[PDB]
Every structure is written in structure tokens, then in C-alpha cells.
């Protein structure tokens, strides 16, 4: 789910 | 107060992890939990004797300093290093009243001129968040500051950075799991470096965050919340769902 930063 | 421990001497991903798991176990009841998301105790009514829990950190150096860490917002207060023990300087007369509350057997308390936020503690660093390196090896060093400021051989600008390597590598870590997995990665790939900014855009967003997702309307937001990406670029998030697995604790509100 940390994918929205990259 | 409850103790929790970690050392940076043989650490690893999963002693870390266990780490960060234990700190933010020990910081929460469980009962509390919106949108997935769990809510630290509310200051207002909390008893004295559940406000604080302590970290207590080692290194290969073989020394210990004690961290405190105010359950309401999980954020750093104060530490003990040998006999004695340091505490930023209080908010107000109940922040102040209850750090008495801390390290009571030591024989030498001091209360810093300066509080733990961010934009001070750069400042007496000479260094900006975007410019101190994280992962082990900064920890370590920290460590070891935090305890050399007790004996005299620790300076003002050393003591600030360490102070901003281990809120960063604690309490943000226990705030959010995006921050623990910056760590993580640091310490997986025996790195050291500085946060990019979508880190530090975090930290400085988490009681924006936490109001927006709790004043949400069933997880909807009044208003966007901005952040950014690790290049830097700005972007908007609308609702909670995408920050549930961001967001570890949140700081209370309302009931």
C-alpha cells in the first residue's frame, strides 16, 4: 500500500 | 511505566519490527479503533500513572538511555541517561506537572529551553530533517550522544540531530507503518540515509491526518489532505482508505 508515494 | 527495549547491537529487520510492534502495543488499548486505524488515549481524564511509557535503547557501544514517550501523541518528552535525565521544555503547567512524574530516582533533573518540535531542533542541529541520515548506524551514534550529553562530552548541535534520528526512528516509526518500512529498508540493505520528502510530509501531517480521518464522514473527507510523493511532487488524498495501510495510531479527538 505504499505504492501512492512513489 | 511500562519498558520497552531495543538495541542496535545485532539488529535486524525482524528485531526492529518487534520492536515498533511492541512500542505501539504497549501505546494503545486496542479498544479504540476507527477505520482500521487505532486512536492513542485521550489526554483529557488520563490517569497519571498510564501517560508514559519508557524505551529503553543499547548499543555496540554498550550504552543505555531511557527515551520517554507521552502515550497521547507518542512523541519523545525527555530521557534518562545514568543519573540523570533531560525533558523538553513543557507546553504548559499540566504537560509540566506530569514530567514530574518521570525518572523520579535521579539525581540530577534539567528541563531544555527549547521543546522537541521539529522546527527547533533543526534549528540547533544546523540541519534540516531532509539532511540526517537514518538506519542503524545513525542510531547507534545517537545513542551514544544522547548519553555523552550527561557526562559533558556531547554539544547542543550533536545532541539535536540525535534527538531528531530517534523521534524520527521511534515514535514516527509507531505512527506509521510507511515510516517503520523506511527504516526497515534501511536497516534490510545496511544503509544509511536521509528521508525523502513524502517522509517527512507524513510527520508533519500526522495530527492533520488524524482529525481528517476521525471528523470523516464514514471515511470520507470535508476537505483533501496534501502530500507528497518521494520526488517531491504534491498530490491530494480524499479519504481514509488509501492511508489505512500508512497510518498505524492516530492522536484522540472525539469519542
Known amino acids: ?6 | 511505566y511500562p519498558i520497552i527495549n531495543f538495541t542496535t547491537a545485532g539488529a535486524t529487520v525482524q528485531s526492529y519490527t518487534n520492536f515498533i510492534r511492541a512500542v505501539r502495543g504497549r501505546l494503545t488499548t486496542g479498544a479504540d479503533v476507527r477505520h482500521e486505524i487505532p486512536v492513542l488515549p485521550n489526554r483529557v481524564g488520563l490517569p497519571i500513572n498510564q501517560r508514559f511509557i519508557l524505551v529503553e535503547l543499547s548499543n555496540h557501544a554498550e550504552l543505555s538511555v531511557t527515551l520517554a514517550l507521552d502515550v497521547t501523541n507518542a512523541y519523545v518528552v525527555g530521557y534518562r541517561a545514568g543519573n540523570s535525565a533531560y525533558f523538553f521544555h513543557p507546553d504548559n503547567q499540566e504537560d509540566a506537572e506530569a514530567i514530574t512524574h518521570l525518572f523520579t530516582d535521579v539525581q540530577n533533573r534539567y528541563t531544555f529551553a527549547f521543546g522537541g518540535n521539529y522546527d527547533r531542533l533543526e534549528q540547533l542541529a544546523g540541519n534540516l530533517r531532509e539532511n540526517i541520515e537514518l538506519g542503524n548506524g545513525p542510531l547507534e551514534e545517537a545513542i551514544s550522544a544522547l548519553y555523552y550529553y550527561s557526562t559533558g562530552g556531547t554539544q547542543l548541535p550533536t545532541l539535536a540531530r540525535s534527538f531528531i534520528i530517534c523521534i524520527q526512528m521511534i515514535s514516527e516509526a509507531a505512527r506509521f507503518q510507511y515510516i517503520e518500512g523506511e527504516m526497515r529498508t534501511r536497516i534490510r540493505y545496511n544503509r544509511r540515509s536521509a528521508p525523502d520528502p513524502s517522509v517527512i510530509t507524513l510527520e508533519n501531517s500526522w495530527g492533520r491526518l488524524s482529525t481528517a480521518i476521525q471528523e470523516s464522514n464514514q471515511g470520507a473527507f470535508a476537505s483533501p489532505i496534501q502530500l507528497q510523493r518521494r520526488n517531491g511532487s504534491k498530490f491530494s488524498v480524499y479519504d481514509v482508505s488509501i492511508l489505512i495501510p500508512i497510518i498505524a495510531l492516530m492522536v484522540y479527538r472525539c469519542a
Open chain 1, 1 to 6: 500500500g505504499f505504492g501512492l508515494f512513489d
